Design a protein around this ligand. Structure first.
Ligand SMILES: [Zn+2]
Ligand SMILES: [Zn+2]
Ligand SMILES: [Zn+2]
Lengths: 183, 184, 184
């Protein structure tokens, strides 16, 4: 069945530190009870565009959050802009915002919201991507399901690095993962 | 849902590593035609592998969870995973009756042959790293091997191992995705 | 379209890295709508890359396998992979006739543009690590790049490289799974 995506162009669609400073490319394809996900990031401007940890040793991580309501609709506090997220139609999107995508949401039994109960690590997936496609420029992408407040479901991407990069543009290789679907 | 075989997504223990029901293996196998998309994680709740302390027990560095299947893809009871809640999905639960056939979910025997006298290829293994407690400095290796057990027609085995000296670290993991070639 | 397009899962050599038919590339592409789920491994059986010795040949550190496709997603004969056994799956074999169209299996050209004077973004690359002989201390990097070859409409290229100093180690790998955005 279907695919929810950001069209795979390079037009900025995401706000990390300043308005439209990045293009998140995210494709979610439903394969029954699992969602197959493919993600990459291009930071085009602003604080995170060029990393220089000699001049700014403190800049070592940032987060992009996707927050969804009970119908699986993206909420406006998300870093990703609402106009950019929809079911695929060709290399573009359907012309009208979708009303329902619960089949694409991370499963709440697998990945419960924060509560008074024990929190398990299975709601996280780690991966490594590479800045500029260079094998000696790893950064970690940590993806977490359903851990944000103010929403019914969430997918968050935390990008971090441990090396001292000097004038390295933050644009990444791609990473694939999956997660258990709500229905 | 006859495209997903799973353990259910709850946290009720279903697996016996060192003692009865000491762990929850969460395993979801989704059939995408000739490939099975697999998602796995592990929570150990009790016993020898629950709290790792390699200062006190320096030799506790690895363990294995085996799923063994018959010619029909039915789980055999000396697998570490219990039979009761390994089944086709129905909602967040399972279908009511135990399944009789799941050959479409078994690892392909031409791709991943049983042990024999013939050359053994590495393609029957997938390696991944998961993280204890979700902490990025607590890696452990998950090694998954297809059809290398005897006394069965098919098998999937998960070997968990680590090389750091962990001190009072609970063995509960992040999730890992992989795929394998299906028998049919 | 649920189909699988593959090399078949046997171990018969189908690929030419340094000399004719020196390797078996096992590649399985399954279409899951707008994404292709890919599973890959490599067995080198002869020639320069069969047994690696970096004490005697320290500069032998990488090689490349290219799949080049025309406008219809048909494999071009200058690819390293041979055309004879690359086809849609039928059982553990292939459909009898060579396929004529597989555009839905090609890497998306907007996501992964062909080479030009325009900025080359890294999103057209996926990196993974596989293990020689299934040994966890024998990593090698598999770098996969989409649509960066000339003389074709689409391409998938696999660059295998390593940084350890291997001494008489056979180049045969564990398996790796990735996905990519489909052209249609
Ligand atoms: Zn710039
Ligand atoms: Zn515990
Ligand atoms: Zn050999």
């Amino acid at each position: 069945t279907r695919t929810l995506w950001t069209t795979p162009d390079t037009s900025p669609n995401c706000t990390i530190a300043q308005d439209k400073d990045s293009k998140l490319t995210l494709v979610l394809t439903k394969c029954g009870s699992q969602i197959l996900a493919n993600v990459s990031l291009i930071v085009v401007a602003g604080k995170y565009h060029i990393i220089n940890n000699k001049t700014n040793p403190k800049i070592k991580s940032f987060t992009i959050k996707l927050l969804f309501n009970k119908n699986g609709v993206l909420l406006d506090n998300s870093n990703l802009g609402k106009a950019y997220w929809n079911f695929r139609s060709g290399n573009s999107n359907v012309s009208t915002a979708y009303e329902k995508a619960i089949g694409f949401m991370p499963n709440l039994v697998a990945y419960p919201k924060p509560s008074n109960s024990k929190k398990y690590a299975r709601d996280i997936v780690y991966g490594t991507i590479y800045l500029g496609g260079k094998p000696d420029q790893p950064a970690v992408i940590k993806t977490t399901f359903n851990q944000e407040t103010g929403c019914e479901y969430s997918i968050t991407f935390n990008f971090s690095w441990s090396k001292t990069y000097e004038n390295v543009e933050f644009e990444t290789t791609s990473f694939t993962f999956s997660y258990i679907a709500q229905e």
